[PDB]
Amino acid sequence: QKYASIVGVDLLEEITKDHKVLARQQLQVLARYLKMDLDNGERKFLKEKDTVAELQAQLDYLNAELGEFFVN
Amino acid sequence: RQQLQVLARYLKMDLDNGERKFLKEKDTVAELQAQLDYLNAELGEFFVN
Amino acid sequence: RQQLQVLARYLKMDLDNGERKFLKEKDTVAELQAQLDYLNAELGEFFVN
Amino acid sequence: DKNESATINEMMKHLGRSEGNPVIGVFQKFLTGHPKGAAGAWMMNGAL
Amino acid sequence: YNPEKKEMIQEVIVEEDLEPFEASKETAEQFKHQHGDKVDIFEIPETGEYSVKLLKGATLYIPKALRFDRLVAGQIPTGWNAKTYGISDDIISQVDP
Amino acid sequence: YNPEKKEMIQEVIVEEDLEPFEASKETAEQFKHQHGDKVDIFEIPETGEYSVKLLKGATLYIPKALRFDRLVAGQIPTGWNAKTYGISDDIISQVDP
Amino acid sequence: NKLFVSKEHAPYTDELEEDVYLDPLARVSKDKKSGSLTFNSKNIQSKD
Numbered sequence: 001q002k003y004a005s006i007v008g009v010d011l012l013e014e015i016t017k018d019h020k021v022l023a024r025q026q027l028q029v030l031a032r033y034l035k036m037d038l039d040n041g042e043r044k045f046l047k048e049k050d051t052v053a054e055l056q057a058q059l060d061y062l063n064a065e066l067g068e069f070f071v072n
Numbered sequence: 073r074q075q076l077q078v079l080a081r082y083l084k085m086d087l088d089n090g091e092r093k094f095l096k097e098k099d100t101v102a103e104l105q106a107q108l109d110y111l112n113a114e115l116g117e118f119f120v121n
Numbered sequence: 122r123q124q125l126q127v128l129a130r131y132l133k134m135d136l137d138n139g140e141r142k143f144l145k146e147k148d149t150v151a152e153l154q155a156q157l158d159y160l161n162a163e164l165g166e167f168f169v170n
Numbered sequence: 171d172k173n174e175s176a177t178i179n180e181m182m183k184h185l186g187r188s189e190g191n192p193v194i195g196v197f198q199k200f201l202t203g204h205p206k207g208a209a210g211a212w213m214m215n216g217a218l
Numbered sequence: 219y220n221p222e223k224k225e226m227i228q229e230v231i232v233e234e235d236l237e238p239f240e241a242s243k244e245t246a247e248q249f250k251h252q253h254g255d256k257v258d259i260f261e262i263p264e265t266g267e268y269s270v271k272l273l274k275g276a277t278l279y280i281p282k283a284l285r286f287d288r289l290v291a292g293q294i295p296t297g298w299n300a301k302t303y304g305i306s307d308d309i310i311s312q313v314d315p
Numbered sequence: 316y317n318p319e320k321k322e323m324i325q326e327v328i329v330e331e332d333l334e335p336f337e338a339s340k341e342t343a344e345q346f347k348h349q350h351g352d353k354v355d356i357f358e359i360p361e362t363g364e365y366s367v368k369l370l371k372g373a374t375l376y377i378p379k380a381l382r383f384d385r386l387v388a389g390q391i392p393t394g395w396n397a398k399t400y401g402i403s404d405d406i407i408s409q410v411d412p
Numbered sequence: 413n414k415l416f417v418s419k420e421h422a423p424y425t426d427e428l429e430e431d432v433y434l435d436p437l438a439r440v441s442k443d444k445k446s447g448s449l450t451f452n453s454k455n456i457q458s459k460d
Binding site for chain 1: 101
């Protein structure tokens with residue numbers, strides 16, 4: 001170990017996936033047939049959280065303008 | 073409708089997941105609005121503006 | 122129609138492959154016929170027969 | 171505006187303008203914007 | 219031209235084959251000469267119009283909107299028209315304003 | 316530029332919804348501002364990249380190829396380069412040839 | 413491959429820019445050190 005220190009010597013799944021891809025597509029065409037919108041929920045969800053931030057921003061303002069103690 | 077349903081089940085894909093999260097946030101909208109409507113009442117419209 | 126289409130896509134099966142090869146050969150038909158129609162004109166019908 | 175102010179000053183200095191007779195500057199672009207092509211012509215019209 | 223809304227396009231790659239649309243013989247052939255292997259065209263026998271199957275690996279341009287930052291200009295007043303001075307319509311449409 | 320092969324595009328209308336593709340937040344929002352109702356965008360939670368569902372009734376540009384008829388020009392000989400006369404690279408790339 | 417030579421500097425320096433512009437008789441002289449033609453303050457508004 002002293003000698004070593006001086007000289008510098010050291011001492012499967014692309015089938016189950018491909019199945020899921022089909023089902024995904026098969027679902028999609030049925031959704032299209034039914035005029036059923038899958039993402040409708042999340043769209044309305046994203047909309048409301050924008051108004052959450054908006055109301056929170058108005059709330060955070062008045063908390064700042066009055067102080068925590070005043071509001072409570 | 074039924075044929076779609078079984079595929080959704082196969083994919084472990086939740087159709088209503090969106091609306092659940094949507095209903096949740098509009099409850100917090102009403103909540104924040106209620107807190108906002110209160111302070112508007114306690115101070116008057118003119119004070120806030 | 123759509124349900125068929127996605128399965129064809131899944132199978133890597135080309136529906137139109139036939140007609141493509143068909144359109145190709147009828148272009149060579151016209152080509153050979155044009156060469157044939159020429160020699161018929163250059164020699165006369167009687168000579169060829 | 172820095173450059174143009176500088177060059178007119180140096181013209182007036184070199185030619186020995188009487189001390190206390192500044193040239194008066196009109197800046198027509200403030201009201202008319204920069205008609206990049208027609209710039210001088212409007213300034214011409216104005217000057218006349 | 220709305221400077222808040224600037225039409226621009228991006229070169230993208232088609233992942234999955236499109237649905238056919240109708241076009242004239244001339245028009246279709248113009249697509250085929252462009253894309254070659256990545257498009258198919260077929261005579262629709264009744265009409266004599268052609269179907270256009272744009273295929274996987276083809277190149278497309280999708281419009282998008284830049285939000286630009288110079289919203290103001292010295293503009294010739296609204297309702298100014300060469301008509302009112304006496305210039306005729308044959309001259310206007312032919313010529314850059 | 317090959318005058319037998321002229322890049323040109325046609326304004327077409329999407330009949331059926333496209334398959335999603337990936338793009339940056341900035342990029343996606345540029346699509347949304349353009350198309351509005353006729354496109355949807357979603358945060359993919361893991362990456363922070365956005366999916367782009369271009370929808371029915373959206374406007375697209377598809378490339379096509381005009382066969383043009385003036386194939387000849389008096390051209391400065393092949394291998395002519397500003398390098399050989401002594402012009403430096405910083406000047407070339409900055410400037411119209 | 414040196415027919416084109418991108419000139420580094422103006423024949424005048426930045427301090428003499430103004431002075432050079434205002435002397436119509438100011439010509440260029442061979443600079444002793446550099447061996448390129450530079451305007452020299454001796455030949456600017458010169459009696460000679």
